[PDB]
Design goal:
metal ion binding, Genome polyprotein (chain A), Enterovirus EV-D68, 3-stranded antiparallel beta sheet, viral protein, hydrolase, homodimer, 10 strands, 1 helix, mainly beta, viral process, 7-stranded antiparallel beta sheet, 53% strand, binds zinc ion, globular
Chain lengths: 138, 137
């Protein structure tokens, strides 16, 4: 439930966690929503949820535990935790209450329909995800 | 968020929602846990969780809504009377608190590691799934 989404031969990861090579091969990139889609050699079978679920379960890494959360629908939110990014509005942000700290970014938030998003930032009982439900042919 | 679990080149479905063709072709069947596994032509969509999670999110079809659950872990449980499977014990049961009515069978219960089980029964404030995390080798 960590790393990123492996939908076939394309990897979805946070913009702030991508490598130089991934940036060189990237097909979709969004600094505002902190997302990057690039072709990779590690083929996978993850699926993107083409749904409207507002409830899900996400993997927290510094606890190695899965936490269910009801989260607020995707929208523009003011975020200053990821000091990689300065205090700014991010787009496609899902906010919820739950454990999250440095290094948890990239963990999977999923619902029965598939992957909803990727953990972006978190601190002090608040966890944030980037909503990927409109990526790779929404 | 309903119907089978399509993994690799197999479909994993409820025993009582299985068709004749897939019952005859199945490489695995277990009536006591309500499970059937058969090769499927369709390409993979899902992954089987190989975890010890006691928490997940399941899809209730009669409300078209996902709900989060904490379940006790696989075990043997008494299942009350049902249309296809009358009152009896069922094996590899996960039990949780949530809505459930007739026809909700086949809903997916999932976690970040993949699909954990399928809804098999439910009434009052209790819902019960079949654990599929043991279909290895
Ligand atoms: Zn969903
Ligand atoms: Zn799990």
């Amino acid at each position: 439930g960590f790393g990123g989404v492996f939908v076939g031969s394309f990897k979805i990861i946070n913009y702030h966690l991508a490598t130089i090579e991934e940036r060189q091969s990237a097909i979709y990139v969004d600094w505002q929503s902190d997302v990057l889609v690039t072709p990779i050699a590690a083929h996978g079978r993850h699926q993107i949820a083409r749904c409207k679920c507002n409830t899900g379960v996400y993997y927290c890494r510094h606890r190695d535990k899965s936490y269910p959360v009801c989260f607020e629908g995707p929208g523009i939110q003011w975020i200053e935790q990821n000091e990689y990014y300065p205090a700014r509005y991010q787009t496609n942000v899902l906010l919820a209450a739950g454990p999250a700290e440095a290094g948890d970014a990239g963990g999977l938030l999923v619902c029965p329909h598939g992957v909803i998003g990727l953990l972006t930032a978190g601190g002090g009982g608040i966890v944030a995800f980037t909503d990927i439900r409109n990526l790779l042919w929404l």
